[PDB]
A paper describes a structure:
[name] is a programmable nuclease for adaptive immunity against invading nucleic acids in CRISPR–Cas systems. Among the [name] orthologs, [name] (Lb2) [name] is the smallest in molecular weight and recognizes a short spacer (14 nt) for cleavage and the creation of indels with high fidelity. Typically, [name] exhibits a bilobed architecture: a recognition lobe (the REC1 and REC2 domains), and a nuclease (NUC) lobe (the WED, PI, RuvC, BH, and Nuc domains) for cleaving nucleic acids. We demonstrate that apo [name] assumes a unique, elongated conformation, whereas the [name]+[name] binary complex exhibits a compact conformation that subsequently rearranges to a semi-open conformation in the [name]+[name]+DNA ternary complex.
Of note, the ternary complex contains an RNA–DNA heteroduplex of only 14 bp that mimics the cleaved heteroduplex that would exist in situ; this 14-bp heteroduplex is shorter than the 20-bp heteroduplex used previously to study [name] orthologs in target cleavage conformation assays. In our [name]+[name]+DNA ternary complex structure, the REC domain is rotated compared with the binary complex, forcing the REC linker (261Leu–273Ser) toward the 14-bp heteroduplex. The RNA–DNA duplex passes through a central channel formed by the REC and NUC lobes, which results in the expansion of the central channel. Unlike FnCas12a, the REC and NUC lobes in [name] are not connected through a Nuc domain stem (Arg1056–Asn1066), which permits flexibility between these lobes in [name]. The 14-bp heteroduplex is not sufficiently long to stabilize the DNA-REC2 contact through the finger helix (234Lys~244Gln). Consistently, the 14-nt guide strand of [name] is the minimum length for efficient cleavage of target dsDNA by [name]. Finally, in the ternary complex, the PI domain is rotated by 38° and lies closer to the PAM nucleotides of the dsDNA. PAM is recognized by the conserved PI domain through Lys575 and Lys518. Rearrangement of the hinge region is also observed in the transition from the binary to the ternary complex. Thus, our comparison of the pre-cleavage binary complex with the post-cleavage ternary complex reveals that bilobed movement drives the structural rearrangement of the ternary complex.
Author numbering: 3 to 289, 319 to 359, 387 to 405, 426 to 462, 475 to 937, 940 to 1205
Write the structure that this text describes.
Amino acid sequence: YESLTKQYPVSKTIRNELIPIGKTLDNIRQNNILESDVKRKQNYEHVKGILDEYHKQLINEALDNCTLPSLKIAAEIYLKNQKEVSDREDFNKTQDLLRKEVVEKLKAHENFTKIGKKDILDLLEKLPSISEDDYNALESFRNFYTYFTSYNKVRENLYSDKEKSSTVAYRLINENFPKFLDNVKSYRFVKTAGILADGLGEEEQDSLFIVETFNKTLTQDGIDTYNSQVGKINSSINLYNQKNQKANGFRKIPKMKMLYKQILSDREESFIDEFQSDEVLIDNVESYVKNDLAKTAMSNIVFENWRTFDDLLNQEYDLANENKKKDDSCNLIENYIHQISDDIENILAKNRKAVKAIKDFLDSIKVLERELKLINSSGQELEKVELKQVDSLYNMTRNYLTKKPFSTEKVKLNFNRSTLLNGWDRNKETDNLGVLLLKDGKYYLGIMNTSANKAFVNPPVAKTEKVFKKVDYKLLPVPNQMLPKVFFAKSNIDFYNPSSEIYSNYKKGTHKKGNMFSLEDCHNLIDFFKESISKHEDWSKFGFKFSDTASYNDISEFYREVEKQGYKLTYTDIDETYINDLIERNELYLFQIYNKDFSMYSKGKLNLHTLYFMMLFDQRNIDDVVYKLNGEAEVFYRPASISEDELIIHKAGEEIKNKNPNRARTKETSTFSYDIVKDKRYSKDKFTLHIPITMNFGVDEVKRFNDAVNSAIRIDENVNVIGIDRGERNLLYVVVIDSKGNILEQISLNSIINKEYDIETDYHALLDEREGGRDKARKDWNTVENIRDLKAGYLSQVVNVVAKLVLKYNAIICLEDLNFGFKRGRQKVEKQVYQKFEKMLIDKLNYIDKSREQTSPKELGGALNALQLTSKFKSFKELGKQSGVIYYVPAYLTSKIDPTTGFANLFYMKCENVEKSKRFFDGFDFIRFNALENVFEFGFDYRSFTQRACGINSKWTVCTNGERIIKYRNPDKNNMFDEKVVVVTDEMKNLFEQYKIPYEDGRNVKDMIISNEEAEFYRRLYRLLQQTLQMRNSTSDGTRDYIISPVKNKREAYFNSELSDGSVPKDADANGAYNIARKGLWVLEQIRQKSEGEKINLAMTNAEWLEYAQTHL
RNA sequence: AAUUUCUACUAAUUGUAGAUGCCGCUACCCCGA
DNA sequence: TGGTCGGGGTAGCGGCTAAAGCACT
DNA sequence: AGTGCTTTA
């Protein structure tokens, strides 16, 4: 499995730590960044609600009020069967948004705001603010490096693929017209809204047949006009919705109309305009006739009852009168809350009034909205008026904590250079302000001061032999763009004439995508590029070796060859004393980096991320196709969190005890030094970096899952398979196997152990009893352990275990499916944390690394070339397919039950009627009894059962022997139950003695039982019949294992889990893991059966699975 | 009870063993004061 | 069941982005 | 005769 190595350009962002070195307090202000007092954020009442609010004008004065409304502009049946046979993929385009130029009509108006042109947001005041304590008019701050592609322009594509299901400006026309073709295929006499709308009497629209400018719902008036009034009238009326019949209540949750949820620009942008008095203004100042009704209590300020008159009317018949469920008219029991919305006869009429009296008044109308319940004004009036137009902006007034990660109004400050760190190339040394440097071992970092940026352009040669080595590099970005950018600029055209024919060819674009042309002229263009780069000196410093003239790289291949060669790092000696001589002038912000790892006596193994950063500048290695520093690397300061006083800590003499068993025993004193210990990471200030990384830079191929597995598929080196399962006693018991089902491991991941350190961790009961502690402590207050953080850490540790197993035994991972599977079901892990375990196991299997103090990195797990075992995942919808080396198989009717009979659920369902029970018995061949082993054995054949193709060969004779510890129900003493049957046999000898039947003849005693008729007799016979087959034991507290299949496995084995043999699963969930492994080997055989890049589906049928499980020997 | 970040660690020790894309685009969900 | 406020996550939704003209004071 | 840069490409 030596393929799959650096076969996908993965990328990461190392998050390292900074500490200064030298003086490192350069500036007179002592900030060293000058992001130390922004002051733009405290008392933000002047500025709040300006930019994002005037986005409302920016959208309103640009969108097209009168679009091309006609759905019939396509002029097409679509698909009603009244058309020609030849579709020719045109009808699906008619379903699709085949129009193009409505965006062109949208963008007709540039639409700058009343307050200011873009220049007010682009002119550099070079200040954090201009506003004042009294008021502000055109407040702004400096530009901060390309807001355009990032913050505000994302809102300006509404008919596009923005990947959010609310900007519904074209999915409405995409969906409603197919729905109307359905509504004319069938007719609307099944829906309730056609006539429940006692008035309008329509499902959605005033007249459903006609088209309409549905974007009226998108604007300020919102979906209230579309929905809210008929929502209000929807109540206990229409008793046939509450009294079933052929229609008008065809389902319990119909709600037959909906326009899809409010657009991104809605729930947003309350009312305010450019005025010379400022307000925080979270509330509707224009007009709050809105009422988000929530109709339970009226006059709750001055009534104090959650239901107004229901509280007054009665208190006994609220529960004394029987509920509606068993005793089914809704209009007499629930119509109270529908007639409760008695409308207020009048229209607190108030606006933002008293702010001018003193400088500080904040929230008048917000307090009015808070204290007053919704105004009960904008009702319904039995017909769907523009009532409740301003719920859409009260929806800004509420939930304002939810929507605001980043607009352009709140970007953070940094060094006095917007482009900080955008590129650390040779030529851009002067402007990008960044410089890399390092001594031996300690990795330094330099940032030039703004005053003397050009001071570093002249490094004098070495004088003293105290080096302070400095690193620089050189590259060539985006060669699709730089190559046409250079040699076609008007300046370089003057400095070097190109041929007019080639310029004409490129301007018309003969050589671009989608054309047949003279390949010799394409070669002429390529030569023009090559020789005009030969003209250069800065570009010519690169060792560029492009292709040959016999057949040159295509233009995409040309840019690939340009990009992959274009990166070279080097270094030059610098006098340390000279750095000391210059830093006095406050001209260079120096830094250096370390963490837990960089310390020689700290011999312990490295963190994985300090290995990458350390090996990045491994100057002895070229790092040609290995990690390359790239892109912006913005820094981040945080302040100190917790004080030393709050750090409660013992002084010298802290011989405290160990929490762990087997180390609280051996070393209870906890021998230690007296550098007394505590988490210090929050005890001080901090500086942090982000270094983007393109691990496996320059790799020339992105591939797929079949590509990411088929190399293993031809020649195996992987045949083993990991099983995974969960259960009660073991949380996540795992089982690996071999090709032919030989179990090779039985380790419970409840227990893990540091083998190299070779001291037992006793992880069992540090897992199960600790999560039990969380279970019994989380009910009343938020425990220290989050509800899933311990599971996250445990699964994180398990990733190392499974990765080591994969690399040791060659085994491939075969986690259970959760799509072809049916239920959600009772589970040991509640919210499908197993799903994010799949995600984590993919995410790490993108790349184990040793991460030790010294390395010889030329290895598969040597941190140079990490094996990319699985390609990246896209979606859980994409899951259910083989994610590289993480296959999936279903898990249903086999997670608990061995397949030897498998009828844990009885082959028939439970019997109630006496004659049906008799018929159910009559399929049996013989019910018998032998007093030797006391076995009251039975007999039956497969063919006489429902679903007579599900199983295969149910001719086995279910026996009855051995004890069972089954979970009785004997609720006499408040849900008591007998913990066991004494033995499964002999509990019905008394039942036979009730009739005194000759049960020792060897006859089919059934012949008498059909003649016997007693309800309790057959009820108890049912209980013992289901219980003798209950082959999994309900393990007690202080668990005991008994996997006891009544059918013999040819040797009276019963797969008895009390035994010690390895092939026998030790526990029930271990047997389930074994079953998942046996499905895993089958799906691997299914894959091997194929012989092309095409692969059959991963799924299984229950019949086929039961067939193979029967034929597992 | 030590970190750069998270779980758990004491683990010969101002540390141990294993894991992680930071800013960022706005959305859904699912049950609930 | 449209009835209102969540409430915290879930999943598919920018990244893994760096030189050169060019209009510049 | 020009440094900031938003532009491109």
